[PDB]
Amino acid sequence: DCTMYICGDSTECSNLLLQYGSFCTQLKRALTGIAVEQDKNTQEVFAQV
Amino acid sequence: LSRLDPPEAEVQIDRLITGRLQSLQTYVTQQLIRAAEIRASANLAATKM
Amino acid sequence: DCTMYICGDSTECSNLLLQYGSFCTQLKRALTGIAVEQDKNTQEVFAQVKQIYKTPPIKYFGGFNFSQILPDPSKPSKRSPIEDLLFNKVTLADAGFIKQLICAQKFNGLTVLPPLLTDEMIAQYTSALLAGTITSGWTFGAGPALQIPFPMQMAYRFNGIGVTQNVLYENQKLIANQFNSAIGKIQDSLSSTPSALGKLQDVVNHNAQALNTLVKQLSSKFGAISSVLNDILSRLDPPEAEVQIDRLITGRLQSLQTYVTQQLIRAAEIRASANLAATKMSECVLGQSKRVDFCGKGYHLMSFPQSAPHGVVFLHVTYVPAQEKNFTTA
Amino acid sequence: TQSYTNSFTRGVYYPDKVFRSSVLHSTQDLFLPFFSNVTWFHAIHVSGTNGTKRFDNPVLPFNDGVYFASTEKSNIIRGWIFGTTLDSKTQSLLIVNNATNVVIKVCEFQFCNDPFLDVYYHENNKSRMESELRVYSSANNCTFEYVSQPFLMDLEGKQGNFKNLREFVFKNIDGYFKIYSKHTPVNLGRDLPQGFSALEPLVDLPIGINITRFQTLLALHRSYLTPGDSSSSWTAGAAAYYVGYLQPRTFLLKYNENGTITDAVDCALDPLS
Amino acid sequence: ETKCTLKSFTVEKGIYQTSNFRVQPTESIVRFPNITNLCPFHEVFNATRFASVYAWNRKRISNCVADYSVLYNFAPFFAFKCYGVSPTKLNDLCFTNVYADSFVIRGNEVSQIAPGQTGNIADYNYKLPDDFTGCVIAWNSNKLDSKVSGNYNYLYRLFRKSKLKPFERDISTEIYQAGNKPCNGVAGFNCYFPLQSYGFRPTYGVGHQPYRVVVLSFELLHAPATVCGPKKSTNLVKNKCVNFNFNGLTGTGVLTESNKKFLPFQQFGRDIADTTDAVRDPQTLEILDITPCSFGGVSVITPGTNTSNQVAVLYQGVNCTEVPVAIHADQLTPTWRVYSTGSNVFQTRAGCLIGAEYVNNSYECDIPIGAGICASYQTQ
Numbered sequence A: 001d002c003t004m005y006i007c008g009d010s011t012e013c014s015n016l017l018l019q020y021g022s023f024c025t026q027l028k029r030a031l032t033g034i035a036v037e038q039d040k041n042t043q044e045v046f047a048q049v
Numbered sequence B: 001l002s003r004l005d006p007p008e009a010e011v012q013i014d015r016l017i018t019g020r021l022q023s024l025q026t027y028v029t030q031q032l033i034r035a036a037e038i039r040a041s042a043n044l045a046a047t048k049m
Numbered sequence C: 001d002c003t004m005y006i007c008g009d010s011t012e013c014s015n016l017l018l019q020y021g022s023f024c025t026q027l028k029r030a031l032t033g034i035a036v037e038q039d040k041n042t043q044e045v046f047a048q049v050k051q052i053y054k055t056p057p058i059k060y061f062g063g064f065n066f067s068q069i070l071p072d073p074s075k076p077s078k079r080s081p082i083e084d085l086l087f088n089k090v091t092l093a094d095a096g097f098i099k100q101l102i103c104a105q106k107f108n109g110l111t112v113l114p115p116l117l118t119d120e121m122i123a124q125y126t127s128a129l130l131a132g133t134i135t136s137g138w139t140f141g142a143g144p145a146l147q148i149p150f151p152m153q154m155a156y157r158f159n160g161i162g163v164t165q166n167v168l169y170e171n172q173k174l175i176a177n178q179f180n181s182a183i184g185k186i187q188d189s190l191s192s193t194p195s196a197l198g199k200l201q202d203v204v205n206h207n208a209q210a211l212n213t214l215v216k217q218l219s220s221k222f223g224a225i226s227s228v229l230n231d232i233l234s235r236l237d238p239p240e241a242e243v244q245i246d247r248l249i250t251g252r253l254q255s256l257q258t259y260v261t262q263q264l265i266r267a268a269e270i271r272a273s274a275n276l277a278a279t280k281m282s283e284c285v286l287g288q289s290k291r292v293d294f295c296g297k298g299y300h301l302m303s304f305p306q307s308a309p310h311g312v313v314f315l316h317v318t319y320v321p322a323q324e325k326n327f328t329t330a
Numbered sequence D: 001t002q003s004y005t006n007s008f009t010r011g012v013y014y015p016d017k018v019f020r021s022s023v024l025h026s027t028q029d030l031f032l033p034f035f036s037n038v039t040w041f042h043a044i045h046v047s048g049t050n051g052t053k054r055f056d057n058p059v060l061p062f063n064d065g066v067y068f069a070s071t072e073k074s075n076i077i078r079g080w081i082f083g084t085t086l087d088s089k090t091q092s093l094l095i096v097n098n099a100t101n102v103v104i105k106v107c108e109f110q111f112c113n114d115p116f117l118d119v120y121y122h123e124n125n126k127s128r129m130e131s132e133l134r135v136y137s138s139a140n141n142c143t144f145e146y147v148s149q150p151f152l153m154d155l156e157g158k159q160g161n162f163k164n165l166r167e168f169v170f171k172n173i174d175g176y177f178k179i180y181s182k183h184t185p186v187n188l189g190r191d192l193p194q195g196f197s198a199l200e201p202l203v204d205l206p207i208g209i210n211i212t213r214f215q216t217l218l219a220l221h222r223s224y225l226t227p228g229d230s231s232s233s234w235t236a237g238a239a240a241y242y243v244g245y246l247q248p249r250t251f252l253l254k255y256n257e258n259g260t261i262t263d264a265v266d267c268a269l270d271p272l273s
Numbered sequence E: 001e002t003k004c005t006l007k008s009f010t011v012e013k014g015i016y017q018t019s020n021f022r023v024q025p026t027e028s029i030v031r032f033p034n035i036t037n038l039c040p041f042h043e044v045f046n047a048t049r050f051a052s053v054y055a056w057n058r059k060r061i062s063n064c065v066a067d068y069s070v071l072y073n074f075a076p077f078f079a080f081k082c083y084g085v086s087p088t089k090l091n092d093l094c095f096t097n098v099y100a101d102s103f104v105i106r107g108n109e110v111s112q113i114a115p116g117q118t119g120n121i122a123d124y125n126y127k128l129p130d131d132f133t134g135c136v137i138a139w140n141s142n143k144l145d146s147k148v149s150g151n152y153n154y155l156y157r158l159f160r161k162s163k164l165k166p167f168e169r170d171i172s173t174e175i176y177q178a179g180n181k182p183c184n185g186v187a188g189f190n191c192y193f194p195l196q197s198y199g200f201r202p203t204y205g206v207g208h209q210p211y212r213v214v215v216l217s218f219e220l221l222h223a224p225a226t227v228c229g230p231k232k233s234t235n236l237v238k239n240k241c242v243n244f245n246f247n248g249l250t251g252t253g254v255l256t257e258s259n260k261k262f263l264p265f266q267q268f269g270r271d272i273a274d275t276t277d278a279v280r281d282p283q284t285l286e287i288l289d290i291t292p293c294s295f296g297g298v299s300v301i302t303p304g305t306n307t308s309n310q311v312a313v314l315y316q317g318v319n320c321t322e323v324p325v326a327i328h329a330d331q332l333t334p335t336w337r338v339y340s341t342g343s344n345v346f347q348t349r350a351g352c353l354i355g356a357e358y359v360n361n362s363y364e365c366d367i368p369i370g371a372g373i374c375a376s377y378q379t380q
């Protein structure tokens, strides 16, 4: 999570970060895609029967 | 924040945020490549099975 | 294009951008390579054959019914009914034909080039492959095509998996009826579930979505006074506005760099998939494969290719046993 | 009559002057939360042909804008007083509308409180409120002046069935008082009907006043339709006058094909939202 | 140019993308709205009942459109010395208040009303603050303000205790208590009246001619602008890449009529891409549409430089009927225009190709252009 990492529990830092556009919405979709791919990998190797 | 006043605190926090964002992007960039290599290995394993 | 996207036709922005050096000759040598690679992929996949074959004017193959896959002359595009259903199923947003508004504002320095092989010559390649694999068997993948009647080819395809020819030559009618029923039902099976054409859909979606956000980053403060370059130029004096200009230009440059980096990895994955598809067509179609589960599920008999927007669709005709009996052995 | 009711889903206004066609744009701004508490506030001054002092019009604060709804006869709640202290240094806004023009003078007054309710104000027989206006009683200190044109002209449908509810939203961010309002007489007798309606901007002017104190001055020269009981502990009591409150939230809004707001959704009401 | 874009003297067979072209603007438009609510200055200036110098007549000025370009012809302006601020450039300054006043003075007292000045008129009547930033305009008034017997309509104060503070008036009909004797209104010896007559005669020429004079105060500080300039507008053009400044909306592109419907209060529309599409009030009120106009890229098709020198140009995504076959100076981005741009034009789904002619034959692709079209260097 961005907010916890970059601006730890400080409202002003989060407000300042909000001006940087969609540099975190992009940083979550990649990791979720990686997680889903990891879940599918072990399924396609074994679930052949 | 406690030691300073908002005007130059903005500059300092901007520097910190850009540095931390640069440090964070590299992590997902490397994770994507590692995931691609792992997926290639998984496909080879599935074919072998 | 850098100068258009980063700078809004402002002399000061261009002059400041010139100081950064070669962060654009580097950012164009990658996308051109990606485009050339994409153009080469389809040519390497489909254009396996040398000569364009034509189906015989008559159509009779001993009970086998190929009307659903062979080209249908009635429609102007000369595309098979299954190909037409596939084309209708996929919804395409931007094709790039003098578009000059879902996809009209992407001309903000961004352009979509058209593919080299128009999606009409691909139909000719597919038709040639179908004719060659129908009237000549697998012998046209090595030398000159040699004709052979379809029942004999099917008999040898059975012989290739340890079943003698008498089975086919005595159950021809039942086999033909089963094949006709299956090929009829495949169309309804495709039409029933919408997720069947998932993968291709995603290829259309993600890139488009990416393009969208690449424009949305234009209207971002990035820590500056405002996202309008002319506004900050007019309202604030020249001698120190270069700080705001540098902030905006570095933000936009980083945003563009991220998009290029993502495109590189996506292209690599697409290349891997295309190489797998080329191997699958070279093995399953122009011959018979003894590998397990590579060409369909079960023992493999034949394959048939069809084209789809930015993709290929294989139909595997396979052989699967049925009810069994116990026996005592020695 | 002090009483609470559920706000349902209402109080949405255009936040900017741009035009959008069939989009799902998201905004972060001051709003009225969905399904909140709206307080009735009632003045009950009528009984027979005798005064019987009411001690009505209690104190009411002003916390970063306010949402107001009414079902006036024609001009019963014409009086509005917005000011820091309403006594001195307040420069309180005195806005009045009685079906012809408005006064937007910005001056300090001790008050304009002089109801002078005639003993013959019984609405059934004698409502002689002709030229009965002792407004802006004296003054305290000012030099500013400003005028404008009328705002609320209730289009009477020649019947009481169309009990119109007028809605207004007031906020004073960096000056520029804004009076977004909607004239929808579609109601028929049900309080706060379910549905959506937008609000349009009318005026703006920087005054610099820290608007902390909010009140009204009714037209006591014609009084009726004032019930009362022992209502308490989160009940309903008729007031013809509602008060809500605003806070900074984030919403997602849907623009129609023509360009009119049709649906909106909160971003913190419910996990589904 | 192809040799220039990649640092070398030799180029091999292939297609290279050199640069891009963009149609330059031709005209600028500033479409400000109507200009009403003019400021009252003729009303102040046009009067024949001006007051006296000791009790001058004031004026308050507030939100109003002020144009200091109408008084010049209305009066002769024998004297037109305003404040040190640029008299020529007065239509570009915005203030929050304009407090002014007027009176009549004598020929010898033209400059006595200046900051830091002394004298009977400048000490006990009116003194000026040192930081006063207001203009002064005076003009002769002997033709009208003169009576053959006596123009006993104005007076002047001469006696007062001390020097008056700036921006103050000291109007009072008291009697000066001259000396130690307490003159309580007797107006006898050791006692005088602090007011005297200021009549005018026809014979009074140089040295005594009354001058009607007006000054106005400026107050420039950190506050919202109230009194501003005219903000003149211009005319409109259609179907021509031009700039615009609609109500402070900078931008450029071709302009056409607008479709769809706008809400009465909405001014400029948007889209999904967060860009401006339509705006309002070019002149009077209507809806009009903006669109980016033609730009694109250029590709150079050429064989090896050691084989030939002829080249072909592919303009990407432009209509052959609208392509710059003119490639005129100024309006067109590409500096080079010595190219033929004639007798060889082909329309393709990828753009417009100039420098080659279509052929009905069919061979293998040598240099891929696109959309099934390929070019090659051949012998006729």
Ligand SMILES: *[C@@H]1O[C@H](CO)[C@@H](O[C@@H]2O[C@H](CO)[C@@H](O)[C@H](O)[C@H]2NC(C)=O)[C@H](O)[C@H]1NC(C)=O
Pocket: C065, C067, C068, C183, C184
């Ligand atoms: C099997 O082949 C026969 C002819 O050899 C096809 O019969 C007709 O095909 C057309 C093609 O669109 C249909 O419109 C007709 O309705 C068919 N005839 C009848 C009587 O129905 C038949 O369609 C082929 N099988 C399949 C599944 O297409």
Ligand SMILES: *[C@@H]1O[C@H](CO)[C@@H](O[C@@H]2O[C@H](CO)[C@@H](O)[C@H](O)[C@H]2NC(C)=O)[C@H](O)[C@H]1NC(C)=O
Pocket: C326
């Ligand atoms: C014949 O084959 C069938 C299976 O097709 C056998 O049926 C199963 O036999 C096992 C042996 O223990 C039982 O546990 C199962 O319950 C049987 N299946 C069912 C559905 O009951 C059968 O045993 C084989 N032999 C004979 C003589 O029938």
Ligand SMILES: *[C@@H]1O[C@H](CO)[C@@H](O)[C@H](O)[C@H]1NC(C)=O
Pocket: D049, D050, D051, D119
């Ligand atoms: C009520 O007030 C009126 C007003 O003058 C007065 O005449 C009347 O007597 C009052 N009622 C009683 C019961 O005194």
Ligand SMILES: *[C@@H]1O[C@H](CO)[C@@H](O)[C@H](O)[C@H]1NC(C)=O
Pocket: D125, D126
């Ligand atoms: C209404 O007015 C009078 C007062 O003048 C009142 O006493 C009576 O109830 C009514 N009279 C008429 C004639 O309507």
Ligand SMILES: *[C@@H]1O[C@H](CO)[C@@H](O)[C@H](O)[C@H]1NC(C)=O
Pocket: D084, D208, D209, D210, D212
């Ligand atoms: C703002 O509010 C405070 C009370 O919190 C009040 O004392 C003050 O007068 C207000 N500001 C102005 C400018 O009136």
Ligand SMILES: *[C@@H]1O[C@H](CO)[C@@H](O)[C@H](O)[C@H]1NC(C)=O
Pocket: D257, D258
């Ligand atoms: C929107 O416009 C269309 C055509 O312009 C019209 O038919 C429709 O009624 C409009 N919707 C409204 C006014 O709500």
Ligand SMILES: *[C@@H]1O[C@H](CO)[C@@H](O)[C@H](O)[C@H]1NC(C)=O
Pocket: E046, E047, E048
């Ligand atoms: C005012 O203007 C009128 C006409 O413009 C003119 O006749 C008159 O003389 C002017 N007033 C003075 C004092 O000159």
Ligand SMILES: *[C@@H]1O[C@H](CO)[C@@H](O)[C@H](O)[C@H]1NC(C)=O
Pocket: E034, E283, E284, E285
């Ligand atoms: C604005 O000025 C123009 C000038 O011709 C004219 O239409 C009118 O006087 C004014 N009002 C409108 C609505 O145009």
Ligand SMILES: *[C@@H]1O[C@H](CO)[C@@H](O)[C@H](O)[C@H]1NC(C)=O
Pocket: E304, E306, E307
């Ligand atoms: C270039 O062309 C010349 C002919 O002018 C030829 O002699 C030479 O071998 C060529 N070299 C290459 C590298 O193509």
Ligand SMILES: *[C@@H]1O[C@H](CO)[C@@H](O)[C@H](O)[C@H]1NC(C)=O
Pocket: C100, E319, E320, E321, E322
């Ligand atoms: C492009 O040119 C052709 C040729 O006449 C014309 O028919 C067409 O309308 C033009 N389209 C545009 C968008 O300019």
Ligand SMILES: *[C@@H]1O[C@H](CO)[C@@H](O)[C@H](O)[C@H]1NC(C)=O
Pocket: E360
């Ligand atoms: C070339 O082909 C076109 C149609 O594709 C035909 O109209 C023309 O006559 C042919 N011959 C030429 C252009 O010499």
